[PDB]
Amino acid sequence: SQPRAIYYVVALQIWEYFSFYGMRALLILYLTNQLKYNDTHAYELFSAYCSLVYVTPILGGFLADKVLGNRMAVMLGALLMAIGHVVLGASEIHPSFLYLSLAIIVCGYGLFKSNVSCLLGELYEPTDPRRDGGFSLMYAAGNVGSIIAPIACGYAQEEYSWAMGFGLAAVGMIAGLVIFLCGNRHFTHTRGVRATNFLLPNWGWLLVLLVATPALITILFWKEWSVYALIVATIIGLGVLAKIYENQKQRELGLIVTLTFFSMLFWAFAQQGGSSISLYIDRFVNTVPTAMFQSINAFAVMLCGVFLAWVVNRTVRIWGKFALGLGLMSAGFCILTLSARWSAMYGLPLMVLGLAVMGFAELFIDPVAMSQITRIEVTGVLTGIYMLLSGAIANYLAGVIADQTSSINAYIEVFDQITWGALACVGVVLMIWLYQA
Return d(Cα 292, Cα 294) in angstroms, integer.
Answer: 6
Phi/psi class of residue 221: alpha, beta or left (left: φ > 0; alpha: ψ in -120 to 50)? alpha
Distances (CA, A) of 143 to 11, 108, 218, 431: 12, 20, 32, 33
List CB contacts of 391: < 8 A, sequence separation 6 or more: 51, 54, 55, 267
Nearest one of 76, 98, 77 to 23, comparing CA atoms: 98
Return d(Cα 413, Cα 419) in angstroms, integer.
Answer: 10
At residue 268's C-alpha, the angle toward residues 224 and 105, to 5°, is: 60
Label residues 29-48 b or e (16+ Cβ within 10 Å = b). Answer: bbbbeebebebebbbbbbbb
Hey, what long-range contacts does 112-115 have (CB within 8 A, 24 or more apart)?
112/16, 112/73, 112/74, 112/77, 112/78, 112/81, 113/57, 113/60, 113/61, 113/77, 114/57, 114/60, 114/61, 114/62, 114/64, 115/60, 115/61, 115/64, 115/70, 115/73, 115/74, 115/77
Return d(Cα 382, Cα 386) in angstroms, integer.
Answer: 6
Length of the chain: 437
Read off φ and ψ for residue 109, nearest 5 degrees.
-60, -40
Mention the CATH class of domain 1-437.
mainly alpha
Q: In three state form, how does the secondary structure of the chain look?
A: CCCHHHHHHHHHHHHHHHHHHHHHHHHHHHHHHCCCCCHHHHHHHHHHHHHHHHHCHHHHHHHHHHCCCCCHHHHHHHHHHHHHHHHCCCCCCCCCHHHHHHHHHHHHHHHHHHHHHHHHHCCCCCCCCHHHHHHHHHHHHHHHHHHHHHHHHHHHHCCCCHHHHHHHHHHHHHHHHHHHHCCCCCCCCCCCCCCCCCCCCHHHHHHHHHHHHHHHHHHHHHCHHHHHHHHHHHHHHHHHHHHHCCCCCCCCHHHHHHHHHHHHHHHHHHHHHHHHHHHHHHHCCCCCCHHHHHHHHHHHHHHHHHHHHHHCCCCHHHHHHHHHHHHHHHHHHHHHHHHHHHHCCCCCCHHHHHHHHHHHHHHHCCCHHHHHHHCCCCHHHHHHHHHHHHHHHHHHHHHHHHHCCCCHHHHHHHHHHHHHHHHHHHHHHHHHHHHHC
Return d(Cα 323, Cα 273) in angstroms, integer.
Answer: 19
Return d(Cα 308, Cα 5) in angstroms, integer.
Answer: 27
Neighbours of 283 (CB within 10 A): 10
Are 131 and 3 a contacting pair, CB within 8 Å? no
Where are the chain's structural domains?
Answer: 1-437
Nearest one of 101, 418, 425, 95 to 276, comparing CA atoms: 418
First to last CA, the chain: 44
Supply the Cα-derived Rg of the chain in whole angstroms: 21
Hey, what long-range contacts does 288-291 have (CB within 8 A, 24 or more apart)?
288/151, 288/154, 288/155, 288/158, 288/159, 290/29, 290/154, 290/158, 291/25, 291/26, 291/29, 291/150, 291/153, 291/154, 291/157
Sign (positive/negative) of CA torsion 225, 226, 227, 229?
positive
List CB contacts of 430: < 8 A, sequence separation 6 or more: 319, 323
List CB contacts of 230: < 8 A, sequence separation 6 or more: 51, 55, 392, 393, 396
Return d(Cα 163, Cα 298) in angstroms, integer.
Answer: 24
CA 145 to chain centre: 14
| Amino acid letter, residue 34 | Q
Residue 317 half-sphere exposure toward CB, CA atoms < 13 A: 9
Neighbours of 154 (CB within 10 A): 24
